[PDB]
Amino acid sequence: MTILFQLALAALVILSFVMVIGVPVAYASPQDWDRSKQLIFLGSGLWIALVLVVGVLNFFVV
Amino acid sequence: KLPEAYAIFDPLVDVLPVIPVLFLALAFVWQAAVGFR
Amino acid sequence: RIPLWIVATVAGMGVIVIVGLFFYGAYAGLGSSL
């Protein structure tokens, strides 16, 4: 539960760091954002579940 | 202080506040890269 | 050839770092008050 929480919360940080540097260069070079429109979508969708994971999961650790 | 669990992020949260300033800064990194058009 | 805009943003952060070290030194050094 705890490590499980620190995983979700900690991974959620690296995804953000990755997501943050990503989306930019994404819409940036139109070399796609059609193939990456796929990547970004998964990052975005993923992120939300994560927040919800850490959200609900918070009430069990603290 | 930060709820017991998140304590591991104490240090992280220590720098968050200053970020906004960075953006005003970046805008300059950019223009420089794009040769002040 | 090293792109100018990089020479700057690098030499730049480099100064905020040293000048920032000075500001930290103000709450620890001899110039402290403690």
Binding site: F17, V20, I21, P24, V25, Y27, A28, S29, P30, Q31 | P11, L12, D14, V15, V18, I19, L22, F23, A25, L26, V29, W30, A33, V34 | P3, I6, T9, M13
Partner: peptide
């Protein structure tokens, strides 16, 4: 102790997300 580790990365991040664009040359 030394969360300067943090700053550092999120710091070279700003210039990075434009540099990679200087490489993939486009939209600056």
């Amino acid at each position: 102790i030394a969360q300067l580790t943090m700053i550092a990365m999120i710091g070279i991040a700003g210039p990075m997300i434009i540099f990679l664009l200087a490489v993939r040359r486009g939209n600056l």
